[PDB]
Amino acid sequence: MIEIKDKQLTGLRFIDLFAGLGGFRLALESCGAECVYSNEWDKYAQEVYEMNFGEKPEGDITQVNEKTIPDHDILCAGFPCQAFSISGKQKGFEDSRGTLFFDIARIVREKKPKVVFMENVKNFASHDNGNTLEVVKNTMNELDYSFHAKVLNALDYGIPQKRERIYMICFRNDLNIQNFQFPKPFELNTFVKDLLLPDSEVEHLVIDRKDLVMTNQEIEQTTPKTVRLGIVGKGGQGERIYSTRGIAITLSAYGGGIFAKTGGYLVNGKTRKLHPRECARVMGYPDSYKVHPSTSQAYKQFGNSVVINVLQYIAYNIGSSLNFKPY
DNA sequence: TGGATGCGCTGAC
DNA sequence: GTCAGCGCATCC
Numbered sequence A: 001m002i003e004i005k006d007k008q009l010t011g012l013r014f015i016d017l018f019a020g021l022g023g024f025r026l027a028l029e030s031c032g033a034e035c036v037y038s039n040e041w042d043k044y045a046q047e048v049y050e051m052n053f054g055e056k057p058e059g060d061i062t063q064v065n066e067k068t069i070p071d072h073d074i075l076c077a078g079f080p081c082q083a084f085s086i087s088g089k090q091k092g093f094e095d096s097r098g099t100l101f102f103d104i105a106r107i108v109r110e111k112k113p114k115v116v117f118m119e120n121v122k123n124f125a126s127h128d129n130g131n132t133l134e135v136v137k138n139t140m141n142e143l144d145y146s147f148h149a150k151v152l153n154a155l156d157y158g159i160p161q162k163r164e165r166i167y168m169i170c171f172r173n174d175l176n177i178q179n180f181q182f183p184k185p186f187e188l189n190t191f192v193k194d195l196l197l198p199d200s201e202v203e204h205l206v207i208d209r210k211d212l213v214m215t216n217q218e219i220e221q222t223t224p225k226t227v228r229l230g231i232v233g234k235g236g237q238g239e240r241i242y243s244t245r246g247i248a249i250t251l252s253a254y255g256g257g258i259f260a261k262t263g264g265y266l267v268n269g270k271t272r273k274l275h276p277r278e279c280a281r282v283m284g285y286p287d288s289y290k291v292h293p294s295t296s297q298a299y300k301q302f303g304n305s306v307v308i309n310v311l312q313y314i315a316y317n318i319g320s321s322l323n324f325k326p327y
Numbered sequence B: 001t002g003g004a005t006g007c008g009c010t011g012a013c
Numbered sequence C: 001g002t003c004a005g006c007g008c009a010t011c012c
């Protein structure tokens, strides 16, 4: 994550729904905002959240009476994506994990915050012939909010990962916000190799499979894209090896394959998956952030998370818009 | 709401 | 056909 000199969100309160690791919390607090509520029902996610923020998020949001949620200015929610991801079955709203957005609408209707800041996977934007995004847009509009949505790729914001996500920023109409803008992309000067840990700390992650098939030559020049160098097995998810001179592939939460959830990388002549701390870095988390003691759970958590840097630029712009109140 | 890994249907070229 | 994917199915 980056340093934020001008705290655009100072004095503003926000809630952290579907909190996970608390990526939205890190981003908004870095801008000066204050978290007044968090909700996350996964046991291990609650543990790591508490480990880092000192509080246990409330459980199952579907059983929480929205009237009990503290007043706030910004509602944050990176809601479930299994039902909308290009990697899944795409059952969408028909999926038992795909109707959480309506719980969000339920809370917004009651708490009417100034801003609703949501995140989901890129496929959410085109899912069901664009009908899914349209539903969210119309729902927010009905709730009397403006709707700004755009897909941003983390590689355009200083983080070496091709993580494409749709970000939806909604302003309550009475605020008459007409100058919100998504952050502009800038040149990437950090690559996977810049975030790796010393070899001595990741030897246990080295995988030497006799069915490894190097398909492309390593590159010496850094490039802002994923560069596949080979595969193992049939080359499915988690069976692909990439160059560290390029950027990382999207981290996943339930990913399989031998290089599960992180993908494989060629490092000093060897092939290995990423260490939880390297996943944290590829997600923009500071080294000060404490990872969950279970590596399996940590990979899952980071795979479900958000790139802090991206949310920071967006949060800054949300604040920039709210603070522009000329006479 | 365990940990591990082989696997494909689909979206976007 | 090329490849990627906050995933899925199934094993212990």
Ligand SMILES: Nc1ncnc2c1ncn2[C@@H]1O[C@H](CSCC[C@H](N)C(=O)O)[C@@H](O)[C@H]1O
Residues within 6 Å of the ligand: A018, A019, A020, A021, A022, A023, A024, A039, A040, A041, A042, A045, A059, A060, A061, A062, A077, A078, A079, A080, A081, A100, A301, A304, A305, A306
């Ligand atoms: N009914 C429910 N109540 C509370 N949390 C839920 C939920 N259904 C799913 N979740 C949680 O929703 C999260 C979605 S992934 C969001 C991660 C978050 N942005 C962070 O930065 O890491 C998961 O952690 C999941 O456990």
